[PDB]
Design a protein around this ligand. Structure first.
Ligand code: MET
Ligand code: NA
Length: 237
């Protein structure tokens, strides 16, 4: 069998979540896609899902991926952004889900885009364990004293209500899917500007995995037969 790493998410469980009272059993949008995908394969792929994470906070998805390279996982399935530093060390499938960083702020703030957020001094929220933190420090070079980790959508909504003047944030930077779910229950906020990364979600496998390529093709069949939008509709103003 394959030891497949699965992120142990504490928020936005609609994507990936451990079943309560199990350790190797998972449900969510990402699992269902992955299952469907393996079924279209011409051969059998036995998997054992292994949780990655302490169950208190969302794990570092980059460290989770690294476990493939240390030979601890034969692969990783979850809501994993295909980003450049990760692609350097493993082989992702093609994106089964489109994603990309956006700015979420209250309707009618002075913050209109990523650009206007950078030039200010005000604090920014990011999701705990997201590559977002790395991007904000290295590519956009925003000071670490401005970045505020946030574990849950409740945490999101609080830091936005509180605002900068009450140890909250002026805005949150996060991948659209999480943002879209958050806004379902919090219509008071909006995505200012456009998407400013095109990093999609994929399944991670060791460099030179025939699995990675064969599933990339599988994902396409699911998209053409409308099963991707079907599974989306089933899990996800
Ligand atoms: C805890 S949310 C992190 C998910 C994000 N796609 C990442 O891969 O870093
Ligand atoms: Na084979």
């Amino acid at each position: 069998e394959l030891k497949i790493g699965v992120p142990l998410r504490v928020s936005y469980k609609e994507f990936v979540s451990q079943i309560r009272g199990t350790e190797n059993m998972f449900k969510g949008f990402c699992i269902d896609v992955f299952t469907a995908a393996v079924n279209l394969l011409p051969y059998a792929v036995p998997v054992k899902f292994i949780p990655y994470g302490n169950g208190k906070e969302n794990p570092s998805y980059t460290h989770m991926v690294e476990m493939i390279t240390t030979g601890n996982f034969d692969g990783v399935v979850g809501d994993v952004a295909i980003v450049t530093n990760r692609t350097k060390i493993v082989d992702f499938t093609q994106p089964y889900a489109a994603s990309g960083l956006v700015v979420v702020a209250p309707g009618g703030t002075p913050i209109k885009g990523i650009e206007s957020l950078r030039e200010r001094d005000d604090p920014i929220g990011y999701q705990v364990g997201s590559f977002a933190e790395s991007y904000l420090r290295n590519e956009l070079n925003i000071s670490e004293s401005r970045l505020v980790p946030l574990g849950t959508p409740e945490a999101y909504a609080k830091a936005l209500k509180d605002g900068p003047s009450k140890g909250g944030v002026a805005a949150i930077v996060d991948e659209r899917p999480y943002v879209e779910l958050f806004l379902s229950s919090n219509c008071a906020y909006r995505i200012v500007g456009q998407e400013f990364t095109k990093s999609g979600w994929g399944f991670a496998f060791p460099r030179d995995s025939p699995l990675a390529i064969d599933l990339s093709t599988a994902i396409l069949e699911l998209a053409e037969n409308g099963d991707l939008q079907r599974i989306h509709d089933k899990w996800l103003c």
